Amino acid sequence: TLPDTVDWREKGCVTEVKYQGSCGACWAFSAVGALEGQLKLKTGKLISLSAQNLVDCSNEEKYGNKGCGGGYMTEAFQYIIDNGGIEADASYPYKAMDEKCHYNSKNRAATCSRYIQLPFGDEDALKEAVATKGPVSVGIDASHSSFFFYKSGVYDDPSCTGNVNHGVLVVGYGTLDGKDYWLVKNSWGLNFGDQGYIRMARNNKNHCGIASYCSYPEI
Numbered sequence: 001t002l003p004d005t006v007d008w009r010e011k012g013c014v015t016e017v018k019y020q021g022s023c024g025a026c027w028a029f030s031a032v033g034a035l036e037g038q039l040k041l042k043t044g045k046l047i048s049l050s051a052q053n054l055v056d057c058s059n060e061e062k063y064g065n066k067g068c069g070g071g072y073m074t075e076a077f078q079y080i081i082d083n084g085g086i087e088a089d090a091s092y093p094y095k096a097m098d099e100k101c102h103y104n105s106k107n108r109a110a111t112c113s114r115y116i117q118l119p120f121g122d123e124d125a126l127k128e129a130v131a132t133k134g135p136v137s138v139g140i141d142a143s144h145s146s147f148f149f150y151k152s153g154v155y156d157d158p159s160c161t162g163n164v165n166h167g168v169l170v171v172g173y174g175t176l177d178g179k180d181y182w183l184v185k186n187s188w189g190l191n192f193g194d195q196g197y198i199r200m201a202r203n204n205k206n207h208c209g210i211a212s213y214c215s216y217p218e219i
């Protein structure tokens with residue numbers, strides 16, 4: 001059986017909310033967020049990892065990522081795997097611009113061996129992964145102005161579609177005033193949503209495509 005409510009923030013597995021600025025780096029923050037969760041669960045240390053390392057060093061056709069022009073969480077993991085590591089944010093800080101890759105293996109802060117993809121649109125599979133594995137990288141349709149008007153409750157705008165466009169991180173789930181939600185960490189800083197988080201409708205026919213492209217890394 002699975003718990004009714006999960007919140008990885010309570011287990012110390014979620015770093016501070018970051019601010020992506022005008023660089024289309026949502027995919028990089030989503031990936032490092034998922035990897036940060038796994039690092040904490042394995043080593044016991046919570047460390048912010050370098051979204052900038054991903055933005056600078058995976059901007060090539062091998063991966064299909066485009067730096068500040070967008071990218072894919074799975075390809076970010078693949079880069080980390082191929083590269084034999086990723087730096088911490090401390091040593092490779094976020095600049096919100098495309099820069100020349102300057103990865104240094106002496107500052108390796110985490111590694112990745114493989115990544116897992118969940119079945120397309122399966123919110124039950126996502127619930128199990130969030131419950132038992134940790135934070136999960138997801139794509140959502142975050143193109144509706146209502147997404148940025150949200151302050152509280154459970155975001156459930158009927159105009160949302162399954163055509164996804166932003167990467168974010170699911171750090172938990174539960175039920176708020178009778179409405180099932182996924183607890184989503186964004187990368188728009190602490191002024192977005194509820195302290196950087198939005199609760200998005202769960203079990204409502206894969207709303208905003210939240211369970212369409214789920215993945216998480218394995219250290």
Ligand SMILES: *C(=N)C1(NC(=O)[C@@H]2C[C@@H](S(=O)(=O)c3ccc(OCC(F)(F)F)cc3C(F)(F)F)CN2C(=O)C2(C)CC2)CC1
Pocket residue numbers: 023024025026027066069070071072073138139140164165166167213214
């Ligand atoms: C964040 N600042 C930005 N968004 C961005 O980088 C997004 C993130 C992913 S996605 O989640 O939108 C996405 C899109 C399409 C996918 O597959 C469709 C297929 F292959 F089935 F046809 C998968 C994903 C997912 F897996 F979830 F990542 C990509 N993306 C993009 O902007 C891209 C590079 C244009 C697609 C920049 C706003």
